């Protein structure tokens, strides 16, 4: 055995951990962008409905 | 292999910190985005109000 | 059930991804435990753990591996023919069991 082999071995696992975590973080960014656009399509739609009512 | 042990325990913290702070800053991102775009849309609607009032 | 016997620092504190595991028994199989306790499974991290207790027949090693990789640890332990010994990290209930045993001892008197 060798502690270098230990480092590579554990880095397989750290690769999995960090990469899944950061892929989900990128999904959180996808939320911040497109789910933000969806909350726009909802709330601004209600605002626009208000303005038709008023007109 | 102790170097690896400690630095990769540190790597567990990279994943957790980045995910957790991304999640907690998603609230900030969404709230800022609301604060911007929807009020801007409000202002466009009031401009359009002035237009139709001119026609009226 | 180890609880009180557990050397508490031998585990990964806040084992969010990396947790310690224990399927290790017969002495007659321990001919290569120096290899196994560091690499029984491929991605083991043994620097921050030790054997919880010693019998003349077995060594109860607290080997480190990942949330999913507990399955791999069990697989290679069973390749070595080891048998259930784990603790699950049950430490607040270790405290509860200490209180219960003390309660029973006092109740005797």
From Swiss-Prot, chain A:
Main location: membrane
Single annotated GO MF: proton-transporting ATPase activity, rotational mechanism
Full protein name: V-type proton ATPase subunit E 1
Location of the protein in the cell: Apical cell membrane; Cytoplasmic vesicle, Secretory vesicle, Synaptic vesicle membrane; Cytoplasmic vesicle, Clathrin-coated vesicle membrane
Source organism of the structure: Rattus norvegicus
Tissue: Expressed in brain (at protein level).
In-chain residues carrying the UniProt-annotated modification Phosphotyrosine: 54
Function comment: Subunit of the V1 complex of vacuolar(H+)-ATPase (V-ATPase), a multisubunit enzyme composed of a peripheral complex (V1) that hydrolyzes ATP and a membrane integral complex (V0) that translocates protons. V-ATPase is responsible for acidifying and maintaining the pH of intracellular compartments and in some cell types, is targeted to the plasma membrane, where it is responsible for acidifying the extracellular environment.
GO annotation, cellular component aspect: apical plasma membrane; clathrin-coated vesicle membrane; cytoplasm; cytosol; endosome; extrinsic component of synaptic vesicle membrane; microvillus; vacuolar proton-transporting V-type ATPase, V1 domain
Subunit structure, as described in the record: V-ATPase is a heteromultimeric enzyme made up of two complexes: the ATP-hydrolytic V1 complex and the proton translocation V0 complex. The V1 complex consists of three catalytic AB heterodimers that form a heterohexamer, three peripheral stalks each consisting of EG heterodimers, one central rotor including subunits D and F, and the regulatory subunits C and H. The proton translocation complex V0 consists of the proton transport subunit a, a ring of proteolipid subunits c9c'', rotary subunit d, subunits e and f, and the accessory subunits ATP6AP1/Ac45 and ATP6AP2/PRR.
Any single GO BP term: proton transmembrane transport
Family membership: Belongs to the V-ATPase E subunit family.
UniProt KW keywords: Acetylation, Cell membrane, Cytoplasmic vesicle, Hydrogen ion transport, Ion transport, Membrane, Phosphoprotein, Synapse, Transport
Curated annotation (Swiss-Prot), chain C:
Domain of life, per lineage: Eukaryota
Cellular localization per UniProt: Cytoplasmic vesicle, Secretory vesicle, Synaptic vesicle membrane; Cytoplasmic vesicle, Clathrin-coated vesicle membrane
Tissue specificity of this protein: Expressed in brain (at protein level).
Protein family (similarity comment): Belongs to the V-ATPase C subunit family.
Record function comment: Subunit of the V1 complex of vacuolar(H+)-ATPase (V-ATPase), a multisubunit enzyme composed of a peripheral complex (V1) that hydrolyzes ATP and a membrane integral complex (V0) that translocates protons. V-ATPase is responsible for acidifying and maintaining the pH of intracellular compartments and in some cell types, is targeted to the plasma membrane, where it is responsible for acidifying the extracellular environment. Subunit C is necessary for the assembly of the catalytic sector of the enzyme and is likely to have a specific function in its catalytic activity.
Subunit structure: V-ATPase is a heteromultimeric enzyme made up of two complexes: the ATP-hydrolytic V1 complex and the proton translocation V0 complex. The V1 complex consists of three catalytic AB heterodimers that form a heterohexamer, three peripheral stalks each consisting of EG heterodimers, one central rotor including subunits D and F, and the regulatory subunits C and H. The proton translocation complex V0 consists of the proton transport subunit a, a ring of proteolipid subunits c9c'', rotary subunit d, subunits e and f, and the accessory subunits ATP6AP1/Ac45 and ATP6AP2/PRR.
Record's protein name: V-type proton ATPase subunit C 1
Originating species: Rattus norvegicus
Taxonomic lineage of the native organism: Eukaryota, Metazoa, Chordata, Craniata, Vertebrata
């Amino acid at each position: 055995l060798s502690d270098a082999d230990v480092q590579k071995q554990i880095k397989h696992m750290m690769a999995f951990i960090e990469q899944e975590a950061n892929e989900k973080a990128e999904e959180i960014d996808a939320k911040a962008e497109e789910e933000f656009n969806i909350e726009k399509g909802r709330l601004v739609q209600t605002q626009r409905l208000k303005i038709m009512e008023y007109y | 292999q102790s170097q690896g042990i400690q630095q990769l325990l540190q790597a567990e913290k990279r994943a957790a910190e980045k995910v957790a702070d991304a999640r907690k800053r998603k609230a900030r991102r969404l709230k800022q985005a609301k604060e911007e775009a929807q009020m801007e849309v409000e202002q466009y609607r009031r401009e359009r109000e002035q237009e139709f009032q001119s026609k009226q | 059930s180890l609880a009180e016997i557990v050397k508490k620092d031998d585990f990964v504190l806040d084992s969010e991804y990396l947790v310690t595991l224990l399927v290790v028994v017969p002495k007659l199989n321990h001919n290569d435990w120096i290899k196994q306790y560091e690499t029984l499974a491929e991605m083991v991290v043994p620097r921050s753990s030790n054997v919880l207790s010693e019998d003349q027949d077995s060594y109860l090693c607290n080997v480190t591996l990942f949330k999913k990789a507990v399955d791999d640890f069990r697989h290679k332990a069973r390749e070595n023919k080891f048998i259930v010994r784990d603790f699950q990290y049950n430490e607040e209930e270790m405290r509860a069991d200490k209180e219960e045993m003390n309660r029973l001892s006092t109740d005797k008197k």
